[PDB]
Amino acid sequence: KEEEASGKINELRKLIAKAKKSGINTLKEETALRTAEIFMGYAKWDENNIDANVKNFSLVKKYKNESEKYAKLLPDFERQEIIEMMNSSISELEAVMRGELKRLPTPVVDWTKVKVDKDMLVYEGKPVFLADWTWKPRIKEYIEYHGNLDGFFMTNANVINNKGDISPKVINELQEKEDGSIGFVFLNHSNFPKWAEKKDPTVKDGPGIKYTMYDINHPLARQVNSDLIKGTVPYMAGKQYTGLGYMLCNEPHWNCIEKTWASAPISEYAYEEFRKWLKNKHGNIDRLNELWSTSYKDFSSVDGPRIMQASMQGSPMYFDFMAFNMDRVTEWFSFLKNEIRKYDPQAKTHIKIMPNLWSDNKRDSGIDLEALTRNSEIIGNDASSCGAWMWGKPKSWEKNYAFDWVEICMAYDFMKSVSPDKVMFNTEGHMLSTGKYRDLYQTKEYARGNYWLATIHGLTATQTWYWCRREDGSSRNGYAASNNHQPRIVNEVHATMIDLNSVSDYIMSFQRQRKPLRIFYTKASSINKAEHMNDVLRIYEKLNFSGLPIGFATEGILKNNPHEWDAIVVYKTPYAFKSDIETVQKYLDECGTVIIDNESFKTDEYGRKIDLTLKQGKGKLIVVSTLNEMKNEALAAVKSNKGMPMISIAETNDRNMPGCEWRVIAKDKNKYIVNIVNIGKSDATVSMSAAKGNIKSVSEVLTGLKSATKIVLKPNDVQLLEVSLE
């Protein structure tokens, strides 16, 4: 397969030179050719280092039993993937050269010239979308086609003394570092300097395991972070390598439920901050004593446990602890951002937030996705998707869906509800592999569908996990059967960016489209309930396959964002802040529509019967009993404001449920752009009609080929169609 692969590579290389002569933009095929050239060397390394790959595959649970076989077959698997990729590239380009496929213009992005503008990354006055790879060697061979993301890494360990002196190695790097390509600054928090630990060992208490291994409420922690930022950021300020911002922490969390993963008790400094937060929350100690059933003489005497028990969920002390943990974490990230802004007043910050700390049920992490998203100039995350785990009972998505769609659809939709006008930067993309998922045979169709779908929901740039391959093909649980062994996956991410760039105005219209239904979200219900996000997902899923972007409402969204929706839905939200209800009342008072079930808005965050109830007044207050009723009323509210899509879609499949998420935008008077992704785990047939009038024609935007009003999508398939009406 070595000789055969080299043959196809040489064939594509000559076809590229010929197409170029005709003025064809061969970026896509050059990207594939470069991928092939790189992975031929990786396959040669694999062929010469079988023993190293046996070890690599043994560390992977589903490839452990057959490790010797897998290490033997890997080199020819990689060459066979290159042969498939060259056959696809040669077929496509020969069709393009013969006028049989229409190739849209697409930019050759110079990353030294990309700028952030509102919710876009701009090259030569147009929106673009960026992909690079974690730990990829920054060499010419790898930055020509596979991304040119720059940046700078630092750690509080680079503060070498109490005086605030910075490691000379770090000063030397920053003095020499060129302006460079668009990049981000990575703040490390796992490595706190030993001199500080020796000076006051309490500085290690109440960590946010494992990525913040010191006390965010300790004064020596604040001195050290202030000293790091003061001594480094003046060298970075305004530089192109800071353009995608300052990443304030890797996967932060301060889990505080005893016997749970990455949990620890909070420090004594943190508990003193808790007494201050309780004084602000409750006003007088008598109000705390009534709720906690305690007899403290004042706020300084509060002296409850420094870690919570799962059995306490629903109690006032538990609520207070989790609410405080969120607020002090938000304040910590505010402190880091305000220190950076002193030395770089243009700094954009973000946080590598795990979206499942909002999309799953747990609220003990101190991660307030709304507050951290609002507080960030760039929407940071490391959203995961991927397929079935290598072990365990099926996840709930496996009944209906090809992959875990919940973070890149529902969490993205929450983040964009909070902040619609920001770039979104996935700083460790987990849409190809995780610790739990791996498949050597992962399809280019899966890879394209995922990056495409995530981009429809707001994703602007991705540093994908991960390019652990060194230039020689050696390695710097995660490695075997990751992208480091998959030539067609590495190539398809960049091919997807090329297509998204080619239609980036359409893509920004899909990202920005009116979200006319907002699901009400409150921390009052998520903190007190074991399974609030099961309920929020159930109503999201119920609404999300009707052609409409589905978004979220909170108190903060209603107070800070234009009310560009037709209705709020309130589902299984029995706990609410009084201020939630008051804010939803003000929306009814502006003639808003609220659709509420029988179970919602019954108590405050302490389970006390609520003094206040929603009154219809000038708006529309609709009480419903079922999910079906709630959906029927929601879509009626959109129809009443003429907000339904201009193209109607029906889906049939062998399941009980839709999987095709679809969207429609206007291209002009009688032409529409239809976006469809099959998130379902089996083939779906979509059937399209005009809402008014009659479909004249359907074509593929990317190919110019004629399509039909009835289409089969395989799982992970993407359709982008131009629909003309008569």
Author numbering: 45 to 520, 526 to 775
Sentences from the paper on this structure:
The polysaccharides in red algae (Rhodophyta) are primarily mixed galactan agars such as agarose and carrageenan. Carrageenans are high molecular weight polymers having a linear backbone of repeating D-galactopyranose units (G) linked together by alternating α-1,3 and β-1,4 linkages. Furthermore, transcriptomics revealed upregulation of the CarPUL during growth on ι-carrageenan, while biochemical analysis of eight CarPUL-encoded enzymes revealed carrageenan-specific activity, thus associating the CarPUL with the ability of these pseudoalteromonads to liberate energy from carrageenan. Detailed analysis of the enzyme activities encoded by the CarPUL, combined with interpretation of growth phenotypes, have allowed us to propose a refined and detailed model of κ- and ι-carrageenan processing by some Pseudoalteromonas species.
We were unable to crystallize GH167 from PS47 so to investigate the molecular determinants for activity on β/κ-NC4 we utilized a homolog from Bacteroides ovatus CL02T12C04 (BovGH167), which originates from the same putative carrageenan PUL as the BovGH16 carrageenase, possesses 36% amino acid sequence identity with GH167, including a conserved putative active site, and has the same enzymatic activity as GH167. The structure of BovGH167 revealed four domains, three of which are often seen within the GH42 family. The conserved domains are domain A, the catalytic (α/β)8-barrel domain; domain B, a 5-stranded parallel β-sheet surrounded by α-helices; and domain C, an anti-parallel β-sandwich. The unique domain is an all α-helical region at the N-terminus. Structural alignment of BovGH167 with BbgII from Bifidobacterium bifidum S17 (PDB ID 4UCF39) revealed that E295 and E472 [E288 and E473 in GH167 (numbering for the predicted matured protein)] overlap with the acid/base and the nucleophile, respectively, with additional conserved residues in the −1 subsite. Generation of glutamine substitution mutants at the putative nucleophile in GH167 and BovGH167 resulted in inactive proteins, confirming the key importance of these residues to catalysis and the location of the conserved −1 subsite. Furthermore, and consistent with the membership of GH167 in clan GH-A, it points to a retaining catalytic mechanism that is shared with family 42 GHs. Further supporting this, GH167 was inactive on κ-NC4 but after treatment of κ-NC4 with S1_19B, which removes the 4-sulfate from the internal G4S residue converting the tetrasaccharide to β/κ-NC4, GH167 again produced products consistent with the formation of κ-NC2 and β-NC2. The activity of GH167 thus appears to have the same activity as the P. hydrolytica “GH42-like” enzyme whereby through hydrolysis of the β-1,4-linkage, the enzymes release β-NC2 from the non-reducing end of β-carrageen and/or hybrid carrageenans.
